[PDB]
Design a protein around this motif. Structure first.
Motif, PDB file in Angstrom:
ATOM      1  N   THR A   9      44.809  30.686  40.466  1.00 11.16           N
ATOM      2  CA  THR A   9      44.493  31.935  39.787  1.00 11.16           C
ATOM      3  C   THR A   9      43.090  32.414  40.139  1.00 11.16           C
ATOM      4  OG1 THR A   9      45.947  31.454  37.893  1.00 11.16           O
ATOM      5  CG2 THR A   9      44.188  33.072  37.558  1.00 11.16           C
ATOM      6  N   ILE A  10      42.973  33.694  40.475  1.00  7.61           N
ATOM      7  CA  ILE A  10      41.685  34.276  40.832  1.00  7.61           C
ATOM      8  C   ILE A  10      41.307  35.403  39.877  1.00  7.61           C
ATOM      9  CG2 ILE A  10      42.787  35.862  42.440  1.00  7.61           C
ATOM     10  CD1 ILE A  10      40.231  35.904  44.052  1.00  7.61           C
ATOM     11  N   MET A  11      40.249  35.187  39.104  1.00  2.26           N
ATOM     12  CA  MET A  11      39.781  36.187  38.151  1.00  2.26           C
ATOM     13  C   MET A  11      38.541  36.903  38.678  1.00  2.26           C
ATOM     14  SD  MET A  11      37.889  35.536  34.530  1.00  2.26           S
ATOM     15  CE  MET A  11      36.263  35.327  35.251  1.00  2.26           C
ATOM     16  N   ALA A  12      38.547  38.229  38.590  1.00  2.00           N
ATOM     17  CA  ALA A  12      37.422  39.030  39.056  1.00  2.00           C
ATOM     18  C   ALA A  12      36.746  39.754  37.896  1.00  2.00           C
ATOM     19  CB  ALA A  12      37.885  40.030  40.105  1.00  2.00           C
ATOM     20  N   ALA A  13      35.422  39.857  37.960  1.00  2.00           N
ATOM     21  CA  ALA A  13      34.656  40.526  36.916  1.00  2.00           C
ATOM     22  C   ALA A  13      34.067  41.838  37.422  1.00  2.00           C
ATOM     23  CB  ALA A  13      33.554  39.612  36.403  1.00  2.00           C
ATOM     24  N   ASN A  14      34.242  42.901  36.644  1.00  2.00           N
ATOM     25  CA  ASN A  14      33.727  44.213  37.015  1.00  2.00           C
ATOM     26  C   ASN A  14      33.273  44.989  35.782  1.00  2.00           C
ATOM     27  OD1 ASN A  14      33.447  45.496  39.684  1.00  2.00           O
ATOM     28  ND2 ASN A  14      34.539  47.213  38.733  1.00  2.00           N
ATOM     29  N   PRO A  15      32.176  45.744  35.929  1.00  2.00           N
ATOM     30  CA  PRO A  15      31.616  46.549  34.839  1.00  2.00           C
ATOM     31  C   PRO A  15      32.503  47.735  34.479  1.00  2.00           C
ATOM     32  CG  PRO A  15      30.467  47.019  36.883  1.00  2.00           C
ATOM     33  CD  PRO A  15      31.396  45.873  37.172  1.00  2.00           C
ATOM     34  N   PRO A  45      32.462  43.075  42.613  1.00  2.00           N
ATOM     35  CA  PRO A  45      32.718  42.199  41.465  1.00  2.00           C
ATOM     36  C   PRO A  45      32.747  40.725  41.857  1.00  2.00           C
ATOM     37  CG  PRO A  45      34.750  43.240  42.176  1.00  2.00           C
ATOM     38  CD  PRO A  45      33.647  43.867  42.983  1.00  2.00           C
ATOM     39  N   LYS A  46      32.457  39.856  40.895  1.00  2.00           N
ATOM     40  CA  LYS A  46      32.451  38.418  41.138  1.00  2.00           C
ATOM     41  C   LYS A  46      33.870  37.895  41.339  1.00  2.00           C
ATOM     42  CE  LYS A  46      28.083  37.468  39.123  1.00  2.00           C
ATOM     43  NZ  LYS A  46      27.603  36.902  40.414  1.00  2.00           N
ATOM     44  N   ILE A  47      33.994  36.814  42.101  1.00  2.00           N
ATOM     45  CA  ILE A  47      35.295  36.214  42.369  1.00  2.00           C
ATOM     46  C   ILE A  47      35.290  34.724  42.047  1.00  2.00           C
ATOM     47  CG2 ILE A  47      37.056  35.744  44.099  1.00  2.00           C
ATOM     48  CD1 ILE A  47      36.739  38.678  43.316  1.00  2.00           C
ATOM     49  N   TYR A  48      36.282  34.288  41.278  1.00  2.00           N
ATOM     50  CA  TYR A  48      36.392  32.884  40.896  1.00  2.00           C
ATOM     51  C   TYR A  48      37.784  32.343  41.204  1.00  2.00           C
ATOM     52  CZ  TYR A  48      32.168  34.078  38.293  1.00  2.00           C
ATOM     53  OH  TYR A  48      30.913  34.514  37.936  1.00  2.00           O
ATOM     54  N   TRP A  49      37.831  31.191  41.863  1.00  2.00           N
ATOM     55  CA  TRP A  49      39.101  30.565  42.218  1.00  2.00           C
ATOM     56  C   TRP A  49      39.408  29.393  41.293  1.00  2.00           C
ATOM     57  CZ3 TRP A  49      42.612  32.302  45.747  1.00  2.00           C
ATOM     58  CH2 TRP A  49      42.186  33.309  46.623  1.00  2.00           C
TER      59      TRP A  49
END
Length: 110
Positions: A82-88, A38-42
């Motif tokens: 805050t770190i938001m992750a994206a997953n299907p 999954p993608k990782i955003y800081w």
């Protein structure tokens, strides 16, 4: 037919809290779950961070362990990363707290 997924992402190691002074380096390690990778955003104090940034250093292991490093930390840096992750299969979020104490004064009297 249960309409749901059992492979959503999850934080194995919640972002720990570290207390340091101004100028001292910092390290934020965390293990994100969920596949595919999954993608990782800081995010910091409502701001976006760049991957190829000089001030900050983002490095992920083969297993997928994100690690944010900081050669120099200032009062501003403080806040809530805050770190938001994206997953299907699901999306999770989390934040941390930092404590920076002014130990040095800038070059310009101010």
């Amino acid at each position: 037919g249960s309409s749901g997924s059992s492979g959503a992402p999850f934080f194995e190691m919640k972002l720990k809290h570290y207390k340091i002074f101004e100028g001292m380096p910092v390290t934020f390690t965390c293990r994100v779950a969920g596949n595919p990778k999954p993608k990782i955003y800081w995010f910091k104090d409502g701001k976006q961070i760049s991957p190829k940034s000089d001030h900050y250093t983002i490095q992920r292991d083969l297993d997928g362990t994100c690690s944010l490093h900081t050669t120099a930390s200032t009062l501003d840096d403080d806040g809530n990363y805050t770190i938001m992750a994206a997953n299907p299969q699901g999306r999770i979020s989390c934040t941390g707290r930092l404590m920076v104490q002014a130990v040095n004064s800038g070059p310009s009297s101010g």
